[PDB]
Each structure stands twice: as C-alpha cells, then as structure tokens.
Amino acid sequence: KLKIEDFELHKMLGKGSFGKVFLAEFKKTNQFFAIKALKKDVVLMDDDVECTMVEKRVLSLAWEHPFLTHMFCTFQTKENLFFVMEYLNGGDLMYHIQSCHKFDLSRATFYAAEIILGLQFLHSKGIVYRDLKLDNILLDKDGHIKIADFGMCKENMLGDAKTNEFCGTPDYIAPEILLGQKYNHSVDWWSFGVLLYEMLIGQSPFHGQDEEELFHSIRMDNPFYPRWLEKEAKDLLVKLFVREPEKRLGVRGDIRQHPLFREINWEELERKEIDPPFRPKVKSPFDCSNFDKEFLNEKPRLSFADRALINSMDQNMFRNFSFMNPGMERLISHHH
Numbered sequence: 001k002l003k004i005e006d007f008e009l010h011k012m013l014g015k016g017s018f019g020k021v022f023l024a025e026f027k028k029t030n031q032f033f034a035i036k037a038l039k040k041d042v043v044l045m046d047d048d049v050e051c052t053m054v055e056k057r058v059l060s061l062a063w064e065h066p067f068l069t070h071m072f073c074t075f076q077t078k079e080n081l082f083f084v085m086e087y088l089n090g091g092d093l094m095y096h097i098q099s100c101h102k103f104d105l106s107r108a109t110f111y112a113a114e115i116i117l118g119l120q121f122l123h124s125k126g127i128v129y130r131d132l133k134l135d136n137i138l139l140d141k142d143g144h145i146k147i148a149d150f151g152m153c154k155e156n157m158l159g160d161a162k163t164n165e166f167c168g169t170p171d172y173i174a175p176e177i178l179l180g181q182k183y184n185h186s187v188d189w190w191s192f193g194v195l196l197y198e199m200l201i202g203q204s205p206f207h208g209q210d211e212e213e214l215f216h217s218i219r220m221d222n223p224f225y226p227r228w229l230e231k232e233a234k235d236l237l238v239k240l241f242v243r244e245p246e247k248r249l250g251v252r253g254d255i256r257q258h259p260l261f262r263e264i265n266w267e268e269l270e271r272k273e274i275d276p277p278f279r280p281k282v283k284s285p286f287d288c289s290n291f292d293k294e295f296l297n298e299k300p301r302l303s304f305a306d307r308a309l310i311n312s313m314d315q316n317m318f319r320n321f322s323f324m325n326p327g328m329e330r331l332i333s334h335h336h
C-alpha cells in the first residue's frame, strides 16, 4: 500500500544533517503532515542506521505525551526512509529567538516547564535524550512546545544502568561526557541548563574559538549571570550547572518545586490548560510562514541515491522500520 507518490510535497520546511522535512498533503484530502525523508545510502555512510531505528522506536512511545512530536506512520522503499509526522506550524525556537534575541522571563519559564514534562516522561520510560538543544524544540499552532528528533536517544536506561557514548551538540554536552565517564539521564539536565540559559540570556553559557577551548570552558568556567537576571532564574541555573552529576537538580531533589515555577500548576500544564505567553501567528492549517525562507524557496525534491551502495548493502538493516497507527490506517483505507 502506502507510497511517497500518495502525497503532494508542497514545501521543503528544512534540510540539514537530519535529512529533508516537507509539508505534505495526503492525496486529495485536506490533511497535512510533516514528512522527514532520508536516503538510505546517506544514512549508511553517516553510520546512522541504529539512530534511525532508535528514532522509530522512541517515536512509537511518544504519541503518549503532548510535548513530543507525534508520528502517524513510518515506511521504507529500496532507497528511502520516511517518517510521516504531525505538521506543527508554530515554528522552531531557534527561528523565533533569532528576531527577539532572548525570550522574556514568563515565556522562557513556560517553555522550560513544558520541556521538563517532556524530558521527565522520556526518563520515566528509560530513555535518555542526549541532544537537547534549541533547534530541536518546535511550537504547535497554539504555542505549546514539541520536542523533535529522537535519533540520539539511549533506550533501556532504567534502574542501575549507564551508557558511555560520546555524543551531543558541542555547546550542550555535559562535563561528565567530556570526561569520558559512564553516564545516565544527568546529561539531559546539563543540556537543559544550557538551553534555558540561552533562552534567558541570548547566548550560550560556555565559549571557545575551537572545540578544545569550548570543552575547556564547559569543564572549568562559571557561567556569566548578568545583574538584571531574575534571582530565581539565576538560582535554577546555578543548580543545573553542578558538575557532579549526582548533585545536579533534575537528578537530585524536585525540579518542579523550584520557585521559578511557583505559579505553575503542573497538572494543568500537562493538559495544555495554561495559555502560552507567546502565540504564533498562523493563518491556516497549512500556513508555513514561521519557517526560514531559505528552505521554503526550494522546489521539493528527493535526491538520487548511490545505486552501488544500495544494491550492495543488506536491506535487512532496516527491518521492522515500518509502522502504522490505527488513525493513519483508517485515512489510507478510506481513500483506497
């Protein structure tokens, strides 16, 4: 059944190391999705085969939480891998922070709280996310956050479990990773600190002209807190930037009880009953104005694959990639 030709790719919303993401409409219907498309030859030579399977598995768990990107289905062809996602048109936080430089206190506080809920959900399932960054936070049409890109996750991290892979995005990487220590969900709470600092202050807490200097900064320096910064925001950041992971808030104590969040009813937040302080400007369900124009101007196209590599690799590499949720299956079979 399902094929890429069943969709119309109206726009390319973005491209990069994650592949291409298109605004797609299923056949006739008035139903839109974001399709992430990957070339199998590229995934293979980037050594991303397992990350791609992790992403698929973690996304099967994610429909259970409001603050993670929901996947409807996943399918493959000899050359391509496709994730058919929920279309989210509020725009990403990196894109939004570019024009205003930094988020006002209430907006940042709100984003931080929703991100806490998403992260804690992932942790309670034994998933360490490991790539928390501003680029990976999307907004829905109403301004609620959605965490995207689960390819870096480590699964099975419940109990007395640790893992040891060096990974992340350099500005956000935890000092225990830099020091080559076995680690758990602690690493996500450092990254969260970095992300919050960026939201409030408009630049990264650690700096260097090359990675060597940056990693030194992450390991050794105290973050700068400007005098204008709200004391409870500073205090939360101080408690996240603890280098001993077992003493870090999120690992220890109860981050939900931090005074920065004293006005938040977490149960209401989780049911999306608290209005986001920032409402994206959206004119329709297909409006794509909250995305970078650099990408929107490109004609949607899937590129060719290296046949020699495709023909020579074991296709079983992507066994069990395919997955379809009941609601999607209904839509397909209705227009069959």
Ligand SMILES: CC1(C)NC(=O)c2ccc(-n3c(=O)[nH]c4ncccc43)cc2N1Cc1ccccc1
Pocket: 013, 014, 015, 018, 021, 034, 036, 069, 070, 085, 086, 087, 088, 089, 092, 135, 136, 137, 138, 148, 149, 291
């Ligand atoms: C985190 C990142 C960079 N990596 C991904 O693998 C990714 C996967 C799915 C979605 N994604 C999604 O799941 N629903 C989306 N709706 C609209 C747009 C993107 C939607 C977004 C993703 N992005 C960010 C992005 C991509 C392209 C354009 C705007 C932002």
